[PDB]
Amino acid sequence: STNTVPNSSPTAASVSTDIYGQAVYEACQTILKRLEPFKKKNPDGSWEDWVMAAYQDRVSLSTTGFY
Amino acid sequence: TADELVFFVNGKKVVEKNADPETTLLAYLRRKLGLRGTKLGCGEGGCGACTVMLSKYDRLQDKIIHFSANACLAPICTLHHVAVTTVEGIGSTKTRLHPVQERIAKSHGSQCGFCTPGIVMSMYTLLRNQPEPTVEEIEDAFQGNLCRCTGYRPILQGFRTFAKPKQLRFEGERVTWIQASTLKELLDLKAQHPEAKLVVGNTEIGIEMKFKNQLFPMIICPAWIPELNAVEHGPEGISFGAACALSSVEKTLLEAVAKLPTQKTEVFRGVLEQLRWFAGKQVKSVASLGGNIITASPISDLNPVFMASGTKLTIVSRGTRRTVPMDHTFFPSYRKTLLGPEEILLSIEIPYSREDEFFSAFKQASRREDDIAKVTCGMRVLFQPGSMQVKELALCYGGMADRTISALKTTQKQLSKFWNEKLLQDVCAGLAEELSLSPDAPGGMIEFRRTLTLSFFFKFYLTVLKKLGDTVGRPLPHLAAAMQASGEAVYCDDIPRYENELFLRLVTSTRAHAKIKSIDVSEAQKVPGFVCFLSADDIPGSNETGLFNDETVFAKDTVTCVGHIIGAVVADTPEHAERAAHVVKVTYEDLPAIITIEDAIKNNSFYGSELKIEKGDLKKGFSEADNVVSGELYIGGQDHFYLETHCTIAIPKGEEGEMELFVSTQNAMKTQSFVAKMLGVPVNRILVRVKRMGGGFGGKETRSTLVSVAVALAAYKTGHPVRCMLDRNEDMLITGGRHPFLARYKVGFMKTGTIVALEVDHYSNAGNSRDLSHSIMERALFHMDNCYKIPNIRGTGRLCKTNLSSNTAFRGFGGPQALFIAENWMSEVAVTCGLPAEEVRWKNMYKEGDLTHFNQRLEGFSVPRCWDECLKSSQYYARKSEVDKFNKENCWKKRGLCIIPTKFGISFTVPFLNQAGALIHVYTDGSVLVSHGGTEMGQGLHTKMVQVASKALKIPISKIYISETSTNTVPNSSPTAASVSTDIYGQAVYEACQTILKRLEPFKKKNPDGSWEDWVMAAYQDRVSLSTTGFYRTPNLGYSFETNSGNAFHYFTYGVACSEVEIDCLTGDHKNLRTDIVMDVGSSLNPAIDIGQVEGAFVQGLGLFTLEELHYSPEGSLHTRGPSTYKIPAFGSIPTEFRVSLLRDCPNKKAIYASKAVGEPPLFLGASVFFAIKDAIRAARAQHTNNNTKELFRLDSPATPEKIRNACVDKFTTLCVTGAPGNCK
Amino acid sequence: DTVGRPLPHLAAAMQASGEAVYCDDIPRYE
Ligand SMILES: Cc1cc2nc3c(=O)[nH]c(=O)nc-3n(C[C@H](O)[C@H](O)[C@H](O)COP(=O)(O)OP(=O)(O)OC[C@H]3O[C@@H](n4cnc5c(N)ncnc54)[C@H](O)[C@@H]3O)c2cc1C
Ligand code: XAX
Ligand SMILES: O=C(O)c1ccccc1O
Ligand code: FES
Ligand code: FES
Ligand SMILES: [Ca+2]
């Protein structure tokens, strides 16, 4: 949708996997940096513990990625 | 074999070949004609949201007439050959706006916008009758129109600029309707079928059918018949046909009063007085005279007047004709008159008054019950020619029994007596006896009622004697205001339905506390279009819901309040879902219920343990005190009364559990979360979209989920789109309101007025789940100081667990309750010390840099400046003298003036909620789409966010747009609450804008003379992303109850209000004369928006403290369920002089562009009206009660006419007037 | 970690059942 990702190129030229793949990878990294301090504080915890603890510490769990 | 119904809408012919008698105009406009400008706000005639214009040819009176009407009550079967004009009919943004529409939009008369179309139509209808109205006519036009948002001032200011036939047969699913064309037909039909129900205006029948569950299989409408519409002047009086509208009666009678000599028009003026503050124009233009008479309500305002004056009734059936004067025998029993079942009322002759004949009518300024216990009367005296010797006396009363009655034994005792002091005494003794109420009489208010019967007579006695001897900082209108005025703004139920869309109706507990033994749907199954009944077993995921996981989505084995949701009906139309729901039978086994705060305390029924804040040494502060005062105070709850009730559409996609919802909510995240948990599905499957709400006020922070989850389950179960919009009566019963509070307190203070010690125990009524009750009580305790330095202090709070709907957030979130309790003991300190109230309050104020009771430092403390400034602009000292002078000169009316400050903490008291995200896209034409976590409820958040974005980006507002709020653009959003949305989304939008500017920078550098569009295109072609998030996190927050330190709030918003009232000591009624407000909002992003918030909040506060009264059966069932029994401020409620100022030169370093939160801080200033009322009562009591100037009397909130009247203890309340001994000179 | 695995198209089962929604499969407004 145009209101989640603006100004996108058409899904064309066989490159969608290459390029949207990189953009998704970069947004993932950003989320990983954000969750890191929480992973370190509680390394035996689950994904869900880290996410909640991030949310409760007012860390944003939303990001764009671009390539 | 049914005739075609033919009418007109906005010029266009409508032919309806299968007209159902049960279809309302509002239903037809919205669901057959696709015209959704006209709104549903109550369905009972009180709110005017559904106002339309109607045009029809009075064949008789011989002209086309135009008048307003409530579409929610107009049967389409009354509309044959009538023309309807709706808001769409007069103009729109797509063509041209009517001047009425443009004007209300530009004058800031529209916030949420839900009431705006109805108001537009009222004004429009006025202008079509009188192109150049007076101010009075303008205000009167809006009597039947309610607005919850604006405080009314800007609408009236804005509009000030305009000043100076064959029988038809219809056959529905259940009802057959006959439109009679002649008197013969009427009498014949009634003979063939005597049980047939007449309908004229349907303003009583509609209520019986919708709310009381009646069904009359045959209906005869006789409106067309000329004899039922004649106005005839006779030698004895003026006769009106039974079908004549109250507005025709009013107009005819006003013309007679203007023309004839006073002595002939005593009765006419009685009639007119009762018609004065009677519903609004919409009701008066459709309600018939005979309808009121034959309805025979115990609280009919007209029947007492007709009875007291011997108004002649001409009554007719086939062959029969008689003319009786109305007397006590006309109403044998509850809702019955003295007509046989064949008989119809034909005409009503209202008499001229003779020589030595006098008349008065009066009515109680409150109503708390559907049809009882509102005192209303007609009073008539006839003396011997030229004398003061009584020849006839009639005193007739409504609201003192289950029918209109006459005080026969009392008046008969007066025949031949003279009109003097002895007579006054004799009549009052008789009245108190003959009309006595047992202390358990239905309707309650025993003392007040008795008192009004006597005081109304006293007023009559006295009357008779007399008869003898960059746009930040700019006042930009709400961005949606024009479309709100035009009916183009889309609210949740205005979204079109899918061809396969279904409708849900909730099935609700009728018991406060009971076992659910069984549920039987076999009668509901017979309803056409029934689809299914849903309950707890249909839930695939979890039945465990609510903010603290202590609620069911559907009641399991027990119910815990009246309105506890048991289940739901799904059907093909909302009317079918409604009918089927009423007929689902639940079998209950009653359990011991706990209802009141006192019940809860007696039974130790609480959620958790005592909350506490404590500082200093109490046994010690009290030791040193010169004076110690203790007491107890109660403040009643409040209903939100958003003009748009709760509503959700749920769209199931059919893939992977996906669901898309549109909902009227302040809390998209919890909606998404609750719906997912109900369905047993990851949150990432659920999408929630909020365009706007027609009001929220806290009531849509959490409680919207009761409807959302149920509708979502229906969508899951059926595979169809499903929607539900609550009726007002359902909305008030189920969704919860403000917390009632009880307070037990004790203050120690010096001779001086200086406070030395305070202990307050607070008890809130929480209802049948936790919800936000714990946080609300924390806010309360944080505000128990108001603006005052208290060296030794202890506040406790306890949450009462009860079998009532769960109470929730309401504008102020516990603060107004605590602040009210604060000013109550403060007012008692001043009176006890015998010092001016403003001196005692000023002396006890915090200074710059003081610590609160929770050890947070007050920096930028502007209360002193607001106070100073309010004192001066309101001319407080001058007027105070004027108030004393007035009271020294008036016996039965008194004035009161009070000035009150407020401080209000800004932030969510849960630290993790103070976070906020935004998402911004710039498209390649340079247009900008902003999305943030906040929702629009009328407060102008999106307007403010566009102004911030435009300033941050350095581009015109016209290039920026905010469409909606959604969980797939900004996730994990806090509820739009705690007044901080401007602060936090302002900041988040700002950051996203900075990011975008940093990315465009190299392109502005390569090309500094290029337009925005050049740079945007150039960054696009350089593959620079034009999309980003922004995020904000309020710094330095974290209060600890165990160490009593850390900041609870980011900063404080301050204000001061002065109000003056005049009370009628004999009736408890009052007029708000003048209010001056000075508010500190820092540097306002939008002075028009902010002043609107000050004005609207203030008026909600004055509602809370003086008008709004919820009332329940002893068994916990809500009695007050609509506008007819729950009174929010109306146009006529606001101060005659209503002045608001924003404090100049006071930037706030804490928030976006130096602004401050404004949403909730000014609501409490409404209490200045309450304390002005208390001031005036004090003068009334010095007049008639005792001579103790340091008397403390309790006065609970709301200060309704009952409580005001009972506090004016006099020779009436005590019955000293009877000759009995009691309290009062 | 499924990268490099022959994971079936995530929507295939729904495509097999006719539950997968294409443009014209969206319900019409009244
Ligand atoms: C918002 C609102 C506010 C109101 N405020 C007040 C108020 O302040 N004071 C007050 O007194 N009332 C008040 N009313 C009541 C109102 O006056 C009545 O509902 C109205 O006058 C009834 O007339 P109708 O034409 O609508 O009757 P309908 O609802 O159509 O009929 C009412 C009853 O009268 C019968 N009836 C009608 N005409 C005849 C006839 N000629 N012969 C025999 N039976 C007949 C019908 O069969 C029916 O049983 C209020 C109503 C509303 C909706
Ligand atoms: N017209 C209009 N104005 C309104 C509202 C409304 O519904 N309509 N509600 C209030 C409430 S009640 Mo609450 O803490 O959820 S108890 S905070 C709050 C406030 C929330 O909006 P910001 O000021 O943060 O943008 O708006 C106020 N102004
Ligand atoms: O502290 C508040 O005012 C508040 C308001 C809404 C929701 C949670 C809260 O703590
Ligand atoms: S909806 Fe018609 S009066 Fe309220
Ligand atoms: S603007 Fe009038 S009810 Fe909201
Ligand atoms: Ca609660």
In the 3-class helix/strand/coil scheme, how is B324-360 assigned residue by residue? EECCHHHCCCCCCCCCCCCCEEEEEEEECCCCCEEEE
CA–CA distance, B853 with B444 (Å, rounded to integer): 41
C9, C22, C29, best to mutate vs chain B, most B CBs in 10 Å? C29
CB pairs under 8 A between B and C: 24
Please identify among residues 6-65 of chain A the ones whose CB lies closer than 8 Å to any CB of chain B.
6-7, 55-58, 60-64
Pocket of ligand 5 contains residue B1100 by CB under 6 Å: no
| DSSP labels, B740-794 | PEEEEEEEEE-TTS-EEEEEEEEEEEEESS-TTHHHHHHHHHHTTTTTB--SSEE
Whether residue B815 contacts residue B778, with contact meaning beta carbons closer than 8 Å, is answered with no
Q: Which residues on adjacent β-strands are paired with residue B376?
A: B363, B398
Tokens standing for B364?
């109680």
CA–CA distance, B644 with B116 (Å, rounded to integer): 12
Query: Among residues B219, B216, B222, B217, which one has the least CA distance to residue B186?
Result: B222
Q: Are strands B893-906 and B1051-1064 parallel, antiparallel or unpaired?
A: antiparallel
In the 3-class helix/strand/coil scheme, how is B1132-1184 assigned residue by residue? HHCCCEEEEEECCCCCCCCCHHHECCCCCCCHHHHHHHHHHHHHHHHHHHHHH
CA–CA distance, B862 with B866 (Å, rounded to integer): 6
Pocket of ligand 4 contains residue B118 by CB under 6 Å: no
Instruction: For residue B805, report the distance from its CA to the centre of ligand 6, in Å.
Output: 8
Tokens standing for B458?
């006293």
Cα angle value B1116/B1119/B1121 (rounded, 5°): 120
Does chain C reach chain B with at least 3 CB pairs under 8 Å? yes
CA–CA distance, B466 with B188 (Å, rounded to integer): 52
Least distant ligand from the CA of B283? 1
Tokens standing for B690?
């909020």
Q: What sign has the CA pseudo-torsion B56, B60, B62, B68?
A: negative
B48: left (phi over 0), alpha (psi -120 to 50) or beta: left
Q: Does B1019 touch chain A (CB under 8 A)?
A: no
Three-state secondary-structure class, residue B268: helix
Q: Which residues on adjacent β-strands are paired with residue B1055?
A: B902, B1079
A23 labelled ligand-binding: no
**B500 to C27: CB separation less than 8 angstroms, yes or no:** yes
| DSSP labels, B715-734 | HHHHSS-EEEE--HHHHHHH
Please identify among residues 247-266 of chain B the ones whose CB lies closer than 8 Å to any CB of chain C.
none
Whether residue A7 contacts residue B1021, with contact meaning beta carbons closer than 8 Å, is answered with no
Q: Are strands B606-615 and B793-801 parallel, antiparallel or unpaired?
A: antiparallel
CA–CA distance, B577 with B582 (Å, rounded to integer): 9
The number of the ligand 3 atom at minimal distance from the alpha carbon of B1160 is 3
Q: How many domains does chain B have?
A: 1
Whether residue B964 contacts residue B690, with contact meaning beta carbons closer than 8 Å, is answered with yes
Whether residue B1069 contacts residue B1208, with contact meaning beta carbons closer than 8 Å, is answered with no
Pocket of ligand 2 contains residue B149 by CB under 6 Å: yes
Q: A66 CA to chain B: closest CA distance, Å?
A: 7
Query: Among residues B749, B756, B766, B872, which one has the least CA distance to residue B817?
Result: B766
Task: Report the chain B residue with the minimal C-alpha distance to residue C30.
Answer: B499
Question: Using CB atoms, which residue from B931, B972, B1025 is nearest to A61?
Answer: B972
Residues of B within 8 A of A53 (CB-CB) are none
Tokens standing for B236?
């004895």
Pocket of ligand 4 contains residue B46 by CB under 6 Å: yes
B328 CB burial (10 A radius; 0-12, 13-18, 19+) = middle
CA–CA distance, B527 with B583 (Å, rounded to integer): 9
Is B349 tagged catalytic? no
Q: Does B721 touch chain C (CB under 8 A)?
A: yes
In the 3-class helix/strand/coil scheme, how is B1033-1078 assigned residue by residue? ECCCCCCECCCCECCCCCEEEEEEEEEEEEEECCCCCEEEEEEEEE
How far is the CA of B1163 from the CAs of B149, B782, B788, B809, B984, in angstroms? 12, 17, 19, 14, 21
Whether residue B701 contacts residue B809, with contact meaning beta carbons closer than 8 Å, is answered with yes
**C29 to B496: CB separation less than 8 angstroms, yes or no:** yes
CA–CA distance, B1076 with B1080 (Å, rounded to integer): 14
Interhelix angle B446-468/B421-434, nearest 10 degrees: 150
Query: Among residues B1101, B446, B525, which one has the least CA distance to residue B811?
Result: B1101
CB neighbours (10 Å) of residue B168? Answer: 20
CA–CA distance, B882 with B78 (Å, rounded to integer): 55
Q: Cis omega (within 30 of 0) on the bond before B740?
A: no
Tokens standing for B260?
């004839």
Whether residue B363 contacts residue B377, with contact meaning beta carbons closer than 8 Å, is answered with yes
Three-state secondary-structure class, residue B1031: strand
Ligand 2 pocket test: which of B937, B948, B985 has the largest number of ligand atoms within 8 Å of its C-beta? B937
Tokens standing for B279?
């519903």
Tokens standing for B706?
């009761």
Interhelix angle B1167-1184/B1087-1106, nearest 10 degrees: 40
Place of tokens 């947070």: B856
Provide the b/e sequence for B750-767 (b: ≥16 CB within 10 Å).
eeebbbbbbbbbbbbbbb
**C27 to B497: CB separation less than 8 angstroms, yes or no:** no
The number of the ligand 2 atom at minimal distance from the alpha carbon of B983 is 24
Tell me, rounded to whole angstroms, the distance of Cα B303 from its chain centroid: 28
The number of the ligand 3 atom at minimal distance from the alpha carbon of B814 is 3
Three-state secondary-structure class, residue B1002: helix
B635 CB burial (10 A radius; 0-12, 13-18, 19+) = buried
**A3 to B923: CB separation less than 8 angstroms, yes or no:** no
Query: Among residues B40, B29, B34, which one has the least CA distance to residue B115?
Result: B40
Q: Which chains touch B (3 or more CB pairs under 8 A)?
A: A, C
Q: What is the DSSP letter of B738?
A: B
Amino acid at B267: V
Query: Among residues B1040, B638, B695, which one has the least CA distance to residue B816?
Result: B638
Provide the b/e sequence for B1060-1078 (b: ≥16 CB within 10 Å).
bbbbbbbbbbbebbbbbbb
Start-to-end C-alpha separation, chain A:
18
Q: What sign has the CA pseudo-torsion B802, B808, B811, B814?
A: positive
Cα angle value B549/B552/B556 (rounded, 5°): 140
B23 CB burial (10 A radius; 0-12, 13-18, 19+) = buried
CB neighbours (10 Å) of residue B682? Answer: 10
- Residue B481 is part of which domain span? 1-1225
Catalytic residue among B349, B434, B1109, B1160: B1160
Tell me, rounded to whole angstroms, the distance of Cα B435 from its chain centroid: 33
- Technique that determined the structure: X-ray
CA–CA distance, B857 with B1052 (Å, rounded to integer): 10
Q: Which residues on adjacent β-strands are paired with residue B929?
A: B921, B961
B449 CB contacts (<8 Å, ≥6 apart)?
B373, B375, B399, B400, B437, B443
- Strand order through the sheet with B793-801: B606-615, B793-801, B755-767, B741-749, B627-635
| DSSP labels, B887-926 | HHH-SSEEEEEEEEEEEEEES-SSGGG-EEEEEEEE-TTS
In Å, what resolution does this model reach? 2.3
Question: Using CB atoms, which residue from A55, A58, A64 is nearest to B1029?
Answer: A64
Q: Are strands B5-9 and B12-16 parallel, antiparallel or unpaired?
A: antiparallel
Pocket of ligand 3 contains residue B780 by CB under 6 Å: no
Contacts 24+ apart (CB under 8 A), B269-274: B269/B359, B270/B305, B270/B308, B270/B309, B270/B359, B270/B360, B270/B361, B270/B378, B271/B302, B271/B305, B271/B350, B271/B361, B273/B360, B273/B361, B273/B362, B274/B301, B274/B302, B274/B305, B274/B361, B274/B363, B274/B376
CA–CA distance, B42 with B49 (Å, rounded to integer): 8
Q: How many helices (H) and strands (E) does chain B have?
A: 34, 44
CB neighbours (10 Å) of residue B637? Answer: 23
Task: Report the chain C residue with the minimal C-alpha distance to residue B499.
Answer: C30
Whether residue B489 contacts residue B120, with contact meaning beta carbons closer than 8 Å, is answered with no
